[PDB]
A paper describes a structure:
ALC1 contains two RecA-like ATPase domains (lobe 1 and lobe 2) and a C-terminal macro domain. Chromatin remodeler ALC1 (amplification in liver cancer 1) is crucial for repairing damaged DNA. It is autoinhibited and activated by nucleosomal epitopes.
ALC1 is notoriously flexible, and crystallization was achieved with single-chain antibodies (scFvs), which were obtained by screening a yeast-display library. The antibody bound to lobes 1 and 2 of ALC1, with no interaction with the key autoinhibitory macro-lobe 2 interface (more discussion below), probably functioning as a rigid scaffold to fix the lobe 1-lobe 2 orientation and hence facilitating crystallization. The macro domain of ALC1 binds to a saddle-shaped surface of lobe 2 formed by the conserved helicase motif IV and the H4-binding sites, with the ADP-ribose binding pocket exposed to the solvent. The bulky side of Trp852 of the macro domain is buried by the binding interface, contacting Arg402 and Arg398 of motif IV. In the structure of ALC1, motif IV adopts a loop conformation, in which the DNA-binding residue Arg402 is buried by the interaction with the macro domain, and is thus inaccessible to the nucleosome substrate. Compared with the WT protein under the same conditions, deletion of the macro domain in ALC1 (1-673) dramatically stimulated the basal and DNA-dependent ATPase activities by factors of ~20 and ~120, respectively, which are much higher than the activities caused by the individual mutations of motif IV and the H4-binding interfaces, suggesting these two elements cooperate to repress the activity of ALC1.
Numbering used by the authors:
A (entry chain A): 582 to 702, 725 to 833
B (entry chain B): 16 to 457, 463 to 493, 513 to 554, 567 to 599, 640 to 678, 715 to 875
The structure:
């Protein structure tokens, strides 16, 4: 496990520059198997990928087209941190920002996440917005993409007010600590997450995420809210 | 007795000494005796069989031993064949780190990533010996077994191979059909736990010797748990060239235990009073989780802040600002830290001291400057061993305490002399503390001060119970920790058994440290929990807080006096342009910086520079005055004017700009000249008074709130001014920082 803590103003005025610094403790910034991503979340705009920076014999920053003209993500090897800067911030940017780490041994599946800073001012894949289930029964969340079998799926579970937690990586590989009942699947143009013996503690949002290599950026899912009948 | 080589006459071969390995590419570390013997064993076994099992106990250097085996068979017979390392996911980072820290000449490639990385690593199939060690997790190798079944692998290394104890494992069946010359298993747990699993690993090693059909026979030949020497020598001689396990007890050259000791301290009257006050601050109004999830987070933050020291909150510090013997007495934690640092100085142990709270960092720094200890810092700006106190300290001039922070621990420093660590501000996750304490080595003693029967107690007990949930894998109740019956006496319960218990905890050697009761608790791989049983006191206090002639002549005299004042004020006004700028009644982070306050770049825009003077200073001294002279020479003339006409007294500041700014016309470097020195210049005498600096800070805060510009202040040092510098920093916080003004203090 690694820790990714973050600091910044949770109250940025309009037409300002939103700056947010995420410090790493437990790993190096220039890790050859890591890429550091900034991602924001809001009930309106959803859960959008903002940007990322990586080091593969050459420091490379990759930004989303949403803010490609007004964003800057800069590393700092001395302080072992990464800073995000957003220019001419609009009230549409009012959200909750997280820093995550895409790790190659996990298929860059954003293993560990940050804590979340609430800032107040090209690929389709569908999810079922609402799925119910009864205790003991088995639930299935379908991530319908366009030939998603040719990509690696990453399933995260987010509790209310909690940060996203990676549940399965590389289609079906499960990180340590997650109960074995959560199983991943991916075939053709359909991926799936299967929860056997649904308990009361399983009610949360469930997202699926992949990486579009044509436009070169991370694409998340719409989300799925699990409902248990305790 | 000539029958030495009676074992089939096999020759004695040779011994691989450490210099040979160091010559063949090893650079990282100097191996230990048993580690060198294990490398010799690995080499001798690579020469004369297909695999083996290195079953040393966890933490004995198995990873670096396999790296040393790589170095050997790469610089002894030039085996540049692919070395396939398969490990669990959590240790691939450690493998990739040690492969480049110990064997830098061996090019290490990690076969990791998604399908895109799958194809991009199918790209690098050049097989030009550009990859000497291919490192991979279990699952990525299990899925991509098609590509990982087409290499003349000379060495396979399965780390923590207890996942292979089931002979019907899918990865076992996949790895059995690989082209491997030498299959080495790394196994931390005692493989002798069950003969079935031991034989499974052996059959994975030698599939033809330890055939599967013989499992039964094997288990029937060693069903006995008794010693049975006549039949025990058989098993011992059989497993000799296949297994190698050494217990931690069998190693006297093992690194010192670095015994982590959790030490217990009490409280203070202020601490308990403010604890029960902040528990009753918002009364926990919300029902379950709508706001308790965040209100209790803030509450726990403030609780650990109070347990560290009550002076974290803005209003706890007394209005007279001067360090004394109350810093030690206002917090039992800081009192225990004082006694512990005294004992460490008596023993001669240079110690590290981390901090999650940087304001706790500032207050520890102030304590060090008080009692006279040499130290450094982690970020911001330090002055104890800089400024002018660097020449002499009451402690030894060489550094004795180091001050660090967990988030800013990646700056990189060398601390080879440190043999003691103190975790006053314990993190809720010790994972950060592991890399924090890694700097001590690279006879240590790790110590953690936490108050008894407090929130820190559960925080660390839960942290330790979670830390044990790694090998063999609410907030309301935890927060409550209803033990207040012990803190019901409203006293301090100041610990004093520690004055003897500290000497009873460690008998320090003449230069280094030399080797669960009242206060000391040694963490020696055990389970520790708590159950907060006495919550009825919490409920009781919850209910208790839920309960709650001559004046006529005075008037005429003051009328005459105000008339005289009107006349004299009109005289002064129409004498020339003589005026003030600040008046009494007219209507959070002190980040330091390095440079000269005359060039303020903090946030660009407007910049309010601050300086302190006395009546009729005019031109003199040097330093910051000379620097501002160089900056358009504005204060010299403006002051000269004000001093010509007797236009200042205790307090009051003139505002005026220097040069111009083309980047933004709205932003200018504003200036300030506070008058805080003594007005005894009638007999050309001088001196400094601090009470007027308070109202000066008041009025400059008023002005900086009106204009909302950045404030910049000097060091205000270079003399015996520690009392006023302590009080002045705290008053700058009280009036500027803690009242919402961007304040910056300039050093160097
Ligand atoms: N003589 C030594 N020199 C350098 N590091 C050592 C030494 N002995 C132990 N270590 C450290 O102890 C840690 C224990 O890891 P290791 O024993 O290789 O894995 P495992 O416990 O799974 O066999 C290693 O990361 C290593 O850095
Ligand atoms: Mg290991």
């Amino acid at each position: 496990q690694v820790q990714l803590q973050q600091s910044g103003p949770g109250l940025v005025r309009p037409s300002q520059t939103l700056s947010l610094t995420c410090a790493i403790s437990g790993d190096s910034v220039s890790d050859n198997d890591a890429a550091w991503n900034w991602v924001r979340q809001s009930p309106s705009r959803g859960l959008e990928w903002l940007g990322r920076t990586y080091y593969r014999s050459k420091w490379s920053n990759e930004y989303a087209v949403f803010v490609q003209s007004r964003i800057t993500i800069n590393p700092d090897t001395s302080k072992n941190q990464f800073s995000l800067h957003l220019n001419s911030v609009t009230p549409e940017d009012t959200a909750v920002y997280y820093c995550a780490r895409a790790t190659r041994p996990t298929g860059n599946g954003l293993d560990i996440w940050g804590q979340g800073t609430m800032v107040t001012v090209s690929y389709v894949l569908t999810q079922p917005p609402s799925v119910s289930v009864a205790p003991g029964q088995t639930a299935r969340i379908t991530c319908g993409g366009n030939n998603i079998g040719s990509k690696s799926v990453h399933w995260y579970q987010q509790k209310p007010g909690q940060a996203p937690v990676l549940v399965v990586y590389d289609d079906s590989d499960r990180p340590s600590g997650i109960p074995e009942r959560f199983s991943g699947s991916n075939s053709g143009n359909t991926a799936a997450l299967t929860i056997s013996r649904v308990e009361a503690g399983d009610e949360a949002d469930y997202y699926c995420q992949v990486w579009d290599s044509s436009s070169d950026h991370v694409v998340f899912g719409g989300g799925t809210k699990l409902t248990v009948l305790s | 007795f000539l029958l030495r080589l009676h074992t089939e006459g096999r020759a004695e071969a040779a011994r691989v000494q450490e210099q040979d390995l160091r010559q063949w590419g090893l650079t990282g570390i100097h191996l230990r005796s048993y580690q060198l013997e294990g490398v010799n064993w690995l080499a001798q076994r690579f020469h004369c069989q297909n695999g083996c099992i290195l079953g040393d106990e966890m933490g004995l250097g198995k990873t670096c031993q396999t790296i040393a085996l790589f170095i050997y068979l790469a610089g002894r017979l030039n085996d540049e064949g692919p070395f396939l390392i398969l490990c669990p996911l959590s240790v691939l980072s450690n493998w990739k780190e040690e492969m480049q820290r110990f064997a830098p000449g061996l090019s290490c490639v990690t076969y990791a990533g998604d399908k895109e990385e799958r194809a991009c690593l199918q790209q690098d199939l050049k097989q030009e010996s550009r990859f000497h060690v291919l490192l991979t997790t279990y699952e990525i190798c299990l899925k991509d077994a098609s590509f990982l079944k087409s290499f003349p692998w000379s060495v396979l290394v399965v780390d923590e191979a207890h996942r292979l104890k089931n002979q019907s494992s899918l990865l076992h069946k996949t790895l059995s059909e690989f082209s491997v010359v030498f299959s080495l298993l790394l196994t931390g747990t005692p493989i002798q736990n069950s003969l079935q699993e031991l034989y499974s690993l052996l059959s994975f090693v030698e599939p033809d010797l330890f055939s599967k059909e013989e499992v039964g026979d094997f288990i029937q030949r060693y069903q006995d748990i008794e010693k049975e020497s006549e039949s025990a020598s058989e098993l011992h001689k059989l497993l000799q060239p296949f297994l190698l396990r050494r217990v931690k007890a069998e190693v006297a050259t093992e690194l010192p235990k670095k015994t982590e000791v959790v030490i217990y301290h009490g409280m203070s009257a202020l601490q308990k009073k403010y604890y029960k006050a902040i528990l009753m601050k918002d009364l926990d109004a919300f029902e379950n989780e709508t706001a308790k999830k965040v209100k209790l987070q803030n509450i726990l933050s403030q609780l650990r802040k109070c347990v560290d020291h009550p002076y974290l909150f803005d209003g706890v510090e007394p209005e007279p600002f001067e360090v004394g013997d109350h810093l030690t007495e206002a917090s039992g934690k800081l009192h225990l830290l004082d006694k512990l640092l005294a004992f460490l100085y008596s023993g001669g142990h240079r110690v590290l001291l981390f901090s999650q709270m940087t304001q706790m960092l500032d207050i520890l720094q102030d304590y060090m400057d008080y009692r006279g200890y040499s130290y450094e810092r982690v970020d911001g700006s330090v002055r104890g061993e800089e400024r002018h106190l660097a020449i002499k300290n009451f402690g030894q001039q060489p550094i004795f305490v180091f001050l660090l922070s967990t988030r800013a621990g990646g700056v990189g420093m060398n601390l080879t002399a440190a043999d003691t660590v103190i975790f006053v501000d314990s993190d809720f996750n010790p994972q950060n503390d592991l890399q924090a304490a890694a700097r001590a080595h690279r006879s240590v003693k790790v110590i953690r001060l936490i108050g008894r029967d407090t929130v820190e107690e559960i925080v660390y007990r839960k942290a330790a119970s979670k830390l044990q949930l790694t090998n063999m894998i609410q907030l309301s109740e935890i927060l409550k920790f209803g033990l207040d019956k012990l803190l019901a006496s409203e006293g301090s319960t100041m610990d004093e058994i520690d004055l003897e218990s500290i000497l009873g905890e460690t008998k320090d050697g003449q230069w280094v440290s030399d080797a669960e009761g009242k206060n000391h608790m040694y963490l020696f791989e055990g389970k520790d929990y708590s159950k907060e049983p006495s919550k009825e006191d919490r409920k009781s206090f919850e209910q208790l807080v839920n309960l709650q002639l001559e004046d006529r002549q005075k008037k005429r005299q003051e009328a005459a006096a105000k008339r005289r004042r009107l006349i004299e004020e009109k005289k002064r006004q129409k004498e020339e342009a003589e005026h003030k700028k600040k008046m009494a009644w007219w209507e959070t982070s002190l980040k330091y910086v390095s440079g000269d306050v005359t060039h303020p770049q903090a946030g660009a825009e407007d910049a309010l520079i601050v300086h302190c003077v006395d009546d009729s200073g005019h031109w003199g001294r040097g330093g910051l005055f000379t620097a501002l002279e160089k900056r358009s020479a504005e204060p010299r003339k403006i002051y000269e004017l004000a001093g010509k006409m007797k236009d200042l007294s205790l307090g009051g500041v003139l505002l005026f700009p220097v040069d111009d700014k083309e980047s933004r016309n709205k932003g200018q470097d504003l200036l300030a000249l506070i008058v805080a020195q003594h007005r005894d210049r009638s007999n050309v005498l001088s001196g400094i008074k601090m009470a007027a600096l308070e109202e000066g800070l008041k009025k400059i805060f008023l002005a900086a709130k009106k204009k909302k510009a950045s404030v910049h202040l000097p060091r205000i040092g270079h003399a015996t001014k520690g009392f006023n510098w302590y009080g002045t920093e705290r008053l700058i916080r009280k009036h500027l920082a803690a009242r919402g003004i961007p304040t910056y203090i300039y050093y160097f």
